[PDB]
Amino acid sequence: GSSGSSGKPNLGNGADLPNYRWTQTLAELDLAVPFRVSFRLKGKDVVVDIQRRHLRVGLKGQPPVVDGELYNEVKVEESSWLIEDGKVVTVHLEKINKMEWWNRLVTSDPEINTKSGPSSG
């Protein structure tokens, strides 16, 4: 009925956003930005910039759907993205450490109760 937490935890302990969906695991993180297009997207048509602690995604000319600092460092030299069905733009993010958990995609999106349980720690 009312509005509270739009971002819900998915199988990939990620967050389901109305603008896009992304998952995060002890291994690596994945982002999926669905674009309302009716044609095939070309690596040039889209603009996905991946950095150490910075990531950007969008379309040439148009405003970047995702623009903000990353929760943590991500092996950029390894990171990579690809176009899905020429409609969506998936971006793989390698977690510098497979022993680290993310709380959100960037420092702009909301956080999610990664941990759970009555335990103190």
Structure description:
- About 0% of the residues lie in helices and about 30% in strands.
- By secondary structure, the chain is mainly beta.
- The protein has a single domain (about 1-120), classed as Immunoglobulin-like (Sandwich), CATH 2.60.40.790.
- The strands form 2 sheets. Strands 1-2-3-8-7 form a 5-stranded antiparallel sheet, with no helix packed on it. Strands 4-5-6 form a 3-stranded antiparallel sheet, with no helix packed on it.
- Strand 1 (about 15) and strand 2 (about 20-25) form a beta hairpin.
- The chain is globular.
- It is found in: Cytoplasm, Cytoskeleton; Nucleus; Cytoplasm, Cytoskeleton, Spindle; Midbody.
- Belongs to the nudC family.
- This is Nuclear migration protein nudC.
- Plays a role in neurogenesis and neuronal migration. Necessary for correct formation of mitotic spindles and chromosome separation during mitosis. Necessary for cytokinesis and cell proliferation.
